[PDB]
């Protein structure tokens, strides 16, 4: 009934602006009946509310945020928007957008997003971004193979197998942050050892925030 | 500012098993709380709201009690699918505020891993540092030790592992272990072994590999 579609950068300097956007599918951002929330989740913290905006121009934001915070909707685009001023470490979350219905029966006003987008990673450094290097987990009734997602900042990666078409057997691991202050994970995936002669493997290395795409064949030797 | 006060953090159920989370905020709420759930990597999905109401598409089996300062989220026959974080939140004054979150595990039968190792390819090499990468797959308990072993010497300090959240069908996880070197270090030896002690092995798995054979 709603779709809410998060962009913006992953890497943002501290003391600089952070500003993310939500496109909206499926209901007008300028319908009365609803709210827009924006809520963060710092890497193995909790989740912290933002504020919510209603087009009338009624907004609140935590007070918490309030005195860096402001947000704001566009119609032309149907999309609404953070920001975020002087930012530091502990700026570093997955932000959420997310839809609310207001009905002061059930809820307080502007306080029950009921949609939420599945968020994005902003991770406040200075450092730059880097691309990952791939390697090949060769092959030595079921055989595994996979590749080696190296050296990598900031997150995420994304992998997929033979473009999209092979996903059952995968797992890609969590990327661990290795000593160097850079990423690294492994995705690996079973398959049957008869299909090894005939079947070609390629695994896809996808690295937005620097604008990286890598494709690594995967055969025996 | 009205803080949430969730328990436990964690819980281990078997499928089917009755399930209780509670959550207490620190002044009167009347109904206005809301449960979530937040499954890995995917949007978190309201399941109750206004303390007792389900939430259209929410199956039945998820069920919300309680008003003022003490709320019940009872699952009343746990799936393999309900693997997520659960978190309360009260909707009475503003900010919104969530409790810190109960983490649901799935207890199932002991399923040993199984193991595979994998060598460094020539094209890292050429950088000067080997990565070798050992693969635990689809076991159960999480509980594994994972030693490495170059030319039988034991290595420590050198390794860093990696676990996949529990799978959503079969609850089951995997595991990866990577051993960093040199290159240098790498070829002053032969023998390369990962070493697998888990519950369900009656005896250690080692697989292993000679470099250049």
């Known amino acids: 009934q709603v779709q809410l579609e998060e962009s913006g950068p992953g890497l943002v300097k501290p003391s600089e602006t952070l500003s993310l956007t939500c496109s909206v599918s499926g209901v007008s951002v300028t319908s009365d009946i609803y709210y827009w929330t924006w809520i963060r989740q710092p890497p193995g913290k909790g989740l912290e509310w933002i504020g919510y905006?209603?087009?009338?121009?009624?907004?609140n934001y935590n007070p918490s945020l309030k005195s860096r915070v402001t947000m704001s909707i566009d119609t032309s685009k149907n999309e609404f928007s953070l920001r975020l001023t002087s930012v530091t470490a502990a700026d570093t979350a997955v932000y959420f957008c997310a839809r609310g219905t207001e009905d002061l029966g059930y809820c307080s006003s502007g306080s029950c997003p009921n949609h939420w987008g599945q968020g994005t990673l902003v991770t406040v450094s200075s450092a730059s971004t880097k691309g990952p290097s791939v390697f090949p987990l060769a092959p030595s009734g079921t055989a595994a193979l996979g590749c080696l997602v190296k050296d990598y900042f900031p997150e995420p990666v994304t992998v997929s197998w033979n473009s999209g078409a092979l996903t059952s057997g995968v797992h890609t691991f969590p990327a661990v942050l290795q000593s160097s202050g850079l990423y690294s994970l492994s995705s690996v995936v079973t398959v049957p050892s008869s299909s090894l002669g005939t079947q070609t493997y390629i695994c896809n290395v996808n690295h937005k925030p620097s604008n990286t795409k890598v494709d690594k064949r995967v055969e025996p030797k | 500012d009205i803080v949430m006060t969730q328990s436990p953090s964690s819980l281990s159920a078997s499928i089917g098993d009755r399930v209780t989370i509670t959550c207490r905020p620190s002044?009167?709420?009347?109904?206005?709380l809301n449960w979530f759930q937040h499954k890995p990597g995917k949007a978190p999905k309201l399941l109750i709201y206004?303390?007792?109401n389900l939430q259209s598409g929410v199956p039945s089996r998820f069920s919300g009690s309680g008003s003022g300062t003490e709320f019940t989220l009872t699952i009343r026959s746990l799936q393999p699918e309900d693997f997520a974080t659960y978190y309360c939140q009260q909707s009475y004054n503003t900010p919104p505020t969530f409790g810190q979150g109960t983490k649901v595990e799935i207890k199932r039968t002991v399923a040993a891993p199984s193991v595979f190792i994998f060598p460094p390819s020539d094209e890292q090499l050429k950088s000067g540092t080997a990565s070798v990468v050992c693969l635990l797959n689809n076991f159960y308990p999480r509980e594994a030790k994972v030693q490495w072993k170059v030319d039988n010497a034991l290595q420590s300090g050198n390794s860093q592992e990696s676990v996949t959240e529990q799978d959503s069908k079969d609850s089951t996880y995997s595991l990866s272990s990577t051993l960093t070197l040199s290159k240098a270090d790498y070829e002053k030896h032969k023998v390369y072994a990962c070493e697998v002690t888990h519950q369900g092995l009656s005896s250690p798995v080692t697989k292993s590999f000679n470099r250049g054979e």
């Open positions: 002044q009167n709420i009347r109904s206005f």
């Open positions: 905006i209603f087009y009338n121009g009624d907004t």
């Open positions: 206004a303390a007792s």
